[PDB]
Amino acid sequence: RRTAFFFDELCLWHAAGPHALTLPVGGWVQPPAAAGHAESPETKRRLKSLLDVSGLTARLQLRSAPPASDEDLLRVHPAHYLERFKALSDAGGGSLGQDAPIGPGSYEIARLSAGLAIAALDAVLAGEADNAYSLSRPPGHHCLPDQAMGFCFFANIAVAIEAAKARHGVERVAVLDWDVHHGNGTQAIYYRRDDVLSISLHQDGCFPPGYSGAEDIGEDRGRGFNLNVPLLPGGGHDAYMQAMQRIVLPALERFRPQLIVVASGFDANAVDPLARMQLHSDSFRAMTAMVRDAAERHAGGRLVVVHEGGYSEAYVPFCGLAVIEELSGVRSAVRDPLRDFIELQQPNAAFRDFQRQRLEELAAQFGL
C-alpha cells in the first residue's frame, strides 16, 4: 500500500494568545508558568517526531501542498468571512469567536492547513496513493461557513470535498468523524445534501456543550444522510466497536461511498483533558481497519484521514501512529505503554450492556 502523509512544519507555528487549557488568561485565570494552550503545536509535533523516530515516516510518501486558493475556499466560505479573518490576522491576531482565538499570520497557516486537506483527497482520487493522512493544523470540523468555533477557522474537510467534486466528479462521499466532539461544521454544510453522508460519533453533550443530536438526521434531500451517535460519557473501546458495527458500517453499506474521509481527532483517548471517553491506540487502529475494509468494498480502497483534535501531549502520538500503521499496512516496533493499563479501566459488563442497548435502539431509529 502507498500511503501519502501531508504535513508542513509551518502548521505547527500557528499560536494563539496565552491560555490555561481552554481558558483565556486574565481575571481569575493566572498565566501558566509553561503550558500556554490546549490546541498546542506539541501534540502534533510529538506525533510527527514519533513517526520519524519509529521509521514510519521513511515508509510513507511525504508531501507538502500549496495553500488553498480563493476559489477553493469560496466554495464553502463567503468572501466576507475570508476578508474579516485576513484583516484580524494581518492586524496581529485576536478573537474570531469565543473558543476561536488567532495569532498573527494565522490566515496563511489556516489556508495551508486547508491546502493539505485538498491535496490529500486529490492525491487519492488521482491514484497517486491508495490512501492518505493529512496532519492539518489548525483543525476544521467545527468551522461553520461564516463562524469560526472550537479552534477551527476553515472547514478543511468540506473545502477538500468540494474541490474534489469540482476536479474529479465524485458523487458519493462519506465523512466519518471520530473526534470526540460533534462535527457540527460538517453537519451544517452538508445538512440538506444526499451526496455527502455525514456521520459523527461523539460524547453526548461534550462540545458543543449539551448537544446530543440523534434526532437531527438531515433536511430535504439530506433527510437520512446525517447520523449522530451520542455516546454516553465514560465509554471506551466496546462502545465504539458497537457504534461502528451497528450504525457506521451498515450506514456505509447502504450509502455505497465512492470516497471515505475520516475527521480523526484523538481526544476520545483515555487521558484527554477535553473529553471523558476511554479509547486506547488499538481502538483507533481497529476503527481504521474497519473503515479501510469499507473503502476497499465500495470506494476501491480510496480513504483519507484528516487530523482534528487530541490534547494529550503524552498519548496522542501513539494513537495517531496506530492509525498510520493501519493505513500503510506497516507495523513499527513502537509499543503503546498505556494499552494494558487502559484495558483494565474499561466500563464493566453492565455499563457496556446499557450502552449496547441504546445503540441497538438508535440503529432501529435510523432503520438499520
Q: Which of residues 299-358 bind Zn ion (CB under 5 A)?
A: 309
Closest separation in Å from C-beta 27 to ligand 9RB: 10
**Cα 325 to Cα 329: distance, rounded to the nearest angstrom:** 6
Segment lying near ligand 9RB (by CB under 6 A), choices 54-62, 122-130, 238-246, 335-343 = 335-343
Task: Kindly give, in sequence order, each residue whose CB lies less than 8 Å from that of residue 201, ignoring residues fewer than 6 positions away.
Answer: 176, 177, 178, 229, 231, 240, 243, 248
**Cα 205 to Cα 182: distance, rounded to the nearest angstrom:** 9
Give the nearer residue to a copy of itself in terms of CB position, either 42 or 195: 42
Selection from 213, 173, 205 nearest residue 366 by Cα: 213
Out of ligand 9RB, Zn ion, K ion, none, what residue 139 binds, judged by CB under 5 to 8 A for its kind, is: ligand 9RB
142: annotated active-site residue:
yes
Phi, psi of 226 (to 5 degrees): -145, 130
Closest separation in Å from C-beta 220 to K ion: 10
Among 185, 236, 257, 309, binds ligand 9RB (CB under 6 A): 309
Question: Using CB under 8 A as the criterion, which residues of the chain lie in contact with a copy of itself when the complex forms?
Answer: 20-23, 27-30, 32-35, 42, 46, 49-50, 53-54, 204-206, 209-210, 212, 232-236, 270-274, 276-278, 312-315, 317-318, 334-335, 337-338, 341, 344-348, 350-351, 354, 358
Segment lying near ligand 9RB (by CB under 6 A), choices 51-59, 247-255, 321-329, 333-341 = 333-341
Closest separation in Å from C-beta 331 to ligand 9RB: 21
Neighbours of 298 (CB within 10 A): 18
Closest separation in Å from C-beta 252 to K ion: 13
Among 42, 99, 216, 336, binds ligand 9RB (CB under 6 A): 99
Residue 230, strand partner residues:
202
Phi, psi of 230 (to 5 degrees): -80, 105
**Cα 365 to Cα 368: distance, rounded to the nearest angstrom:** 8
Question: Cβ distance 318 to 334 under 8 Å?
Answer: yes
> Is residue 183 within the footprint of K ion (CB under 5 A)?
yes
With the C-alpha atoms ordered 127, 128, 132, 138, is the resulting torsion angle positive or negative?
A: negative
x/- site string to Zn ion, residues 128 to 167, per CB under 5 A? ----------------------------------------
Task: Kindly give, in sequence order, each residue whose CB lies less than 8 Å from that of residue 177, ignoring residues fewer than 6 positions away.
Answer: 141, 183, 186, 198, 199, 200, 201, 202, 262, 263, 265, 308
Residue 189, classed as helix, strand or coil, is helix
Segment lying near K ion (by CB under 5 A), choices 30-38, 218-226, 306-314, 320-328 = 218-226
98 exposure class (CB count in 10 Å sphere: 0-12, 13-18, 19+)? exposed
Q: Which of residues 200-259 bind ligand 9RB (CB under 6 A)?
A: 207
Task: Just list the catalytic residues.
Answer: 142
Residues that bind ligand 9RB (CB under 6 A): 22-23, 98-99, 139, 142, 150-151, 179, 181, 207, 265, 267, 274, 308-309, 337-338, 341
Residues that bind K ion (CB under 5 A): 177, 179, 183, 190, 193, 196, 198, 200, 202, 222, 225-226
Residues that bind Zn ion (CB under 5 A): 179, 181, 265, 267, 309
